[PDB]
Amino acid sequence: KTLGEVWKRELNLLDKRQFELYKRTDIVEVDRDTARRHLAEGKVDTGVAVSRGTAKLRWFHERGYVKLEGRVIDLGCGRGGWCYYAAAQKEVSGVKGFTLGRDGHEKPMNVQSLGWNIITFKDKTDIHRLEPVKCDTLLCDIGESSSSSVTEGERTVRVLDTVEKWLACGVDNFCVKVLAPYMPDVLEKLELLQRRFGGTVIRNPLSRNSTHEMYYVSGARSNVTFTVNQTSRLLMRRMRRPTGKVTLEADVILPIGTRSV
Numbered sequence: 001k002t003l004g005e006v007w008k009r010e011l012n013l014l015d016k017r018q019f020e021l022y023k024r025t026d027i028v029e030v031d032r033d034t035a036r037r038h039l040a041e042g043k044v045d046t047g048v049a050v051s052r053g054t055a056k057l058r059w060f061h062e063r064g065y066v067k068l069e070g071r072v073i074d075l076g077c078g079r080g081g082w083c084y085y086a087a088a089q090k091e092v093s094g095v096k097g098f099t100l101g102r103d104g105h106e107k108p109m110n111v112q113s114l115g116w117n118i119i120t121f122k123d124k125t126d127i128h129r130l131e132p133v134k135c136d137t138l139l140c141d142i143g144e145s146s147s148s149s150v151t152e153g154e155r156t157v158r159v160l161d162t163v164e165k166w167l168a169c170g171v172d173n174f175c176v177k178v179l180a181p182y183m184p185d186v187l188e189k190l191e192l193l194q195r196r197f198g199g200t201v202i203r204n205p206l207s208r209n210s211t212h213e214m215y216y217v218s219g220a221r222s223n224v225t226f227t228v229n230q231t232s233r234l235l236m237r238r239m240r241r242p243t244g245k246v247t248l249e250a251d252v253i254l255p256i257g258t259r260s261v
């Protein structure tokens, strides 16, 4: 019924070539060539990002969508792209990252970009059952794609449900992935959360066309329904007007070393 639900249905109707063409339509992504080469060679002191996540968080941070301050907690940290980005910011005093890191799930990567020493990575952790901890900045980048809109909705509502427990502890800043903001129940939950904690949902330009993911962030306040539909319209336009045109941008390079007393 929602424009996003229509988008999801049409996305699944594309043949293999149509899908490939759509995925490459008017997108922007960082060039990962150097980072991948450095990581494959075991280089840990060149400042490259462990994942594309570093550039995604940088985009939100550099324009005030989320302030990264004090005690940072990263739920579903994976390799740690958000943890390393946060650790390099002067306003951040410490970073605690949690992730599954088992049964195919990405494990934290150990590199020595600026502030690596103030990060505490913990794997074998299901954040849905992790007792909330007090922090100043709450980050969460969880949401597994599914060809089923119903499944994406269920997964998204579960993430928001868990995150609400953490926000209820009192946090100043947050950036939380919302996998399927186009689903009716998710929109309503977001409206309720906004009335309780403020913020709004924003589409990151680095996100792929094949996902409707948006992020619930603390740095702005706007009508959720409007912004989500704005994104649905953009994604539908790209599907109807394929181009396969990709734009590349420089990946993030962080300073290196420890942050000490």
Ligand SMILES: Nc1ncnc2c1ncn2[C@@H]1O[C@H](CSCC[C@H](N)C(=O)O)[C@@H](O)[C@H]1O
Binding pocket: 050, 051, 052, 053, 054, 075, 076, 077, 078, 079, 080, 081, 082, 083, 098, 099, 100, 101, 105, 106, 125, 126, 127, 128, 141, 142, 143
């Ligand atoms: N219930 C759960 N508990 C902990 N981690 C989970 C989880 N469900 C998914 N994850 C992890 O959440 C991660 C999402 S991808 C996160 C990428 C990260 N922001 C970066 O910048 O590198 C994946 O590693 C996935 O394994």
